[PDB]
Amino acid sequence: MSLAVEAVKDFLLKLQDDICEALEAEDGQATFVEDKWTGGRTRVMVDGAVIEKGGVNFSHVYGCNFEAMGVSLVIHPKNPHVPTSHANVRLFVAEPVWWFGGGFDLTPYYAVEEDCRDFHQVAQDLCKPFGADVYARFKGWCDEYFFIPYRNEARGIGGLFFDDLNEWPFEKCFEFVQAVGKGYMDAYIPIVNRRKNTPYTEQQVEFQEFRRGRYAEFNLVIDRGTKFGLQSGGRTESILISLPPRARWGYNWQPEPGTPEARLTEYFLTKRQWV
Amino acid sequence: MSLAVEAVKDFLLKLQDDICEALEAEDGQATFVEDKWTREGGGGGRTRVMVDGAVIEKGGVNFSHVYGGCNFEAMGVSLVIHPKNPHVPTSHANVRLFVAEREGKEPVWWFGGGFDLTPYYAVEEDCRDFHQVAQDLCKPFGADVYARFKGWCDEYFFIPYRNEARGIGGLFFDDLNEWPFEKCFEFVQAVGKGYMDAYIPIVNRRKNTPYTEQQVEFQEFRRGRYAEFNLVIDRGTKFGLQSGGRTESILISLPPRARWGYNWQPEPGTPEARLTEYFLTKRQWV
Numbered sequence A: 001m002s003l004a005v006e007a008v009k010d011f012l013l014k015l016q017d018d019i020c021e022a023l024e025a026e027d028g029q030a031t032f033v034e035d036k037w038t039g040g041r042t043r044v045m046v047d048g049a050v051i052e053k054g055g056v057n058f059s060h061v062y063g064c065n066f067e068a069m070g071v072s073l074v075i076h077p078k079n080p081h082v083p084t085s086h087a088n089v090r091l092f093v094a095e096p097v098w099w100f101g102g103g104f105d106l107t108p109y110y111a112v113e114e115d116c117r118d119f120h121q122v123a124q125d126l127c128k129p130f131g132a133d134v135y136a137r138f139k140g141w142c143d144e145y146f147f148i149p150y151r152n153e154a155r156g157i158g159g160l161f162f163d164d165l166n167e168w169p170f171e172k173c174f175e176f177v178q179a180v181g182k183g184y185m186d187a188y189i190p191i192v193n194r195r196k197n198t199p200y201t202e203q204q205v206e207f208q209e210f211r212r213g214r215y216a217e218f219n220l221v222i223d224r225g226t227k228f229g230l231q232s233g234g235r236t237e238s239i240l241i242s243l244p245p246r247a248r249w250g251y252n253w254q255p256e257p258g259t260p261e262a263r264l265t266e267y268f269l270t271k272r273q274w275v
Numbered sequence B: 001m002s003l004a005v006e007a008v009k010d011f012l013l014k015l016q017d018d019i020c021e022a023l024e025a026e027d028g029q030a031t032f033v034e035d036k037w038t039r040e041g042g043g044g045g046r047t048r049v050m051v052d053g054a055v056i057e058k059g060g061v062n063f064s065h066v067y068g069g070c071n072f073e074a075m076g077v078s079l080v081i082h083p084k085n086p087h088v089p090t091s092h093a094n095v096r097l098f099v100a101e102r103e104g105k106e107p108v109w110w111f112g113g114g115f116d117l118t119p120y121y122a123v124e125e126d127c128r129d130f131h132q133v134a135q136d137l138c139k140p141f142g143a144d145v146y147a148r149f150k151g152w153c154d155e156y157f158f159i160p161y162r163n164e165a166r167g168i169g170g171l172f173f174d175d176l177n178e179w180p181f182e183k184c185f186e187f188v189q190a191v192g193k194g195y196m197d198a199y200i201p202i203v204n205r206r207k208n209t210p211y212t213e214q215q216v217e218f219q220e221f222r223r224g225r226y227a228e229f230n231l232v233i234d235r236g237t238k239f240g241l242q243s244g245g246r247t248e249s250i251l252i253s254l255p256p257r258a259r260w261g262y263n264w265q266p267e268p269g270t271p272e273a274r275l276t277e278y279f280l281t282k283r284q285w286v
């Protein structure tokens, strides 16, 4: 599958370009600066109108020999009313066992029901042609994966997660990750556009930062991709672009019940049925 | 072993209070919080946390007692202190005892613990003093004890994927049972006392030092490194979280605020660069 694998590589590089262009257009102030290494292409945006810290990475890496390639991204907006988001699409080939993985997910601070519904609707719509149960399966997997067990708490409002994807022919699995990659932009960008101009306060930023401690915890304690990258000698700063620009931790920190800070965990993180 | 283990518990609970007293004496106005709990198996904990002081921003001192293929009992104190002023180092200490039953023989026991210093704007004299207290407390127990446990501290408190030490070191030990129980117990008592003797003078000396917004920003970037060590590497933290321990008690180690920046490194030749240029790789203080 040398031609097929190169087809996946060409798609991933273009996907990175396209996602970067789309986020640059929304921000329209800041841009992605590229760090090429050997290998990979790490693109980072800081201090924009909208994006406080964002990273969109392409990597191509080489007891069993393997080749892997993928795009991974995490966007941390300045405005607490714009959710953090994450997406991934990847291919693993173990020499000739192959599989795809990926997904996207939304991490609100001050959540809006309609946005959560829209985000999931984009996900449901893109999965439908690939199988009647694909959305249910990979939405459920997203809920199970992006969970902090020791806090009994979801990371976000969900989306799609999949791994070990090879149940369909290579062509169809490839088409699926193309749909997921395009879908990320269709799901997230309209929410960015709708919420980026919402006024916010210093107190709302403080809440955002406490919530970003939860995000950091997931990525550093739990996330499998992060752990493998760090263990296998990957590029530290490329792997850890996911970390928030600022986080807070407080002893016994919990929002007072009946505050909008509390509603995130009282309602939004526990709903788990958006469409 | 019941009486012996009870004596260790008594020591640990007193040490928790003594350390809190020593730290508050320097601060004068930190708010103290306490949580206590027990577990159905037996055991439990007591966490004391000082926050929003003139000197200590977030300082936690935890006592826990755990019962859990063989049955075991464990108890210990763990603490992490994060000052408000960048010129006062963060510090950490631990003393612990494990006792595990074995079939067909007497239980196996061991102690572990240590203390260590995590500066932001380090000072050579302070690093030397900190290590001298450690060297002096070890001397009565054996001529190679400081060298062993200082070296172990350097090995353990290291972030391999950044090729960077966490701090300037101190003492670290585990599996300590090469001496009779009573001598090992005396050693962890000396380590616990030693923590105060090593750290409190530095707090007293540095707490009034002027600081700037830029220095606090640097402190926060450095605290990202600290969070990484505890969440990615630290074995005790992992084991606590995996075992269903009290989350907020385990995570007292995390800094009040941290920053992460893509490729962030201090500018060479600046005061912010001194920590990594000189202090972290010196590893020779007495």
Ligand SMILES: O=C(O)CC1CCCC1
Pocket (backbone or CB within 6 Å): A057, A059, A060, A061, A068, A069, A070, A071, A072, A088, A089, A090, A091, A225
């Ligand atoms: O999706 C990514 O982050 C890249 C893949 C994961 C490890 C190498 C390729």
Ligand SMILES: O=C(O)CC1CCCC1
Pocket (backbone or CB within 6 Å): A055, A057, A072, A073, A074, A225, A226, A229, A238, A239, A240, A241, A242
């Ligand atoms: O997390 C990211 O955004 C980058 C990927 C995470 C693990 C490998 C690369």
Ligand SMILES: O=C(O)CC1CCCC1
Pocket (backbone or CB within 6 Å): A040, A059, A061, A228, A229, A230, A232, A233, A234, A235, A238, A239
């Ligand atoms: O090379 C690896 O171990 C994979 C890392 C994950 C993101 C970049 C490289």
Ligand SMILES: O=C(O)CC1CCCC1
Pocket (backbone or CB within 6 Å): B062, B063, B064, B065, B066, B074, B075, B076, B077, B078, B094, B095, B096, B097, B236
């Ligand atoms: O010293 C501690 O932090 C407590 C010990 C570790 C697990 C139980 C006792």
Ligand SMILES: O=C(O)CC1CCCC1
Pocket (backbone or CB within 6 Å): B039, B043, B044, B045, B062, B064, B065, B066, B240, B244, B245, B246, B249, B250
């Ligand atoms: O949660 C407990 O009962 C004890 C835990 C062990 C380390 C800190 C808390």
Ligand SMILES: O=C(O)CC1CCCC1
Pocket (backbone or CB within 6 Å): B060, B062, B078, B079, B080, B236, B237, B240, B249, B250, B251, B252, B253
């Ligand atoms: O980090 C602390 O200070 C608390 C201990 C860490 C592992 C168990 C408790």
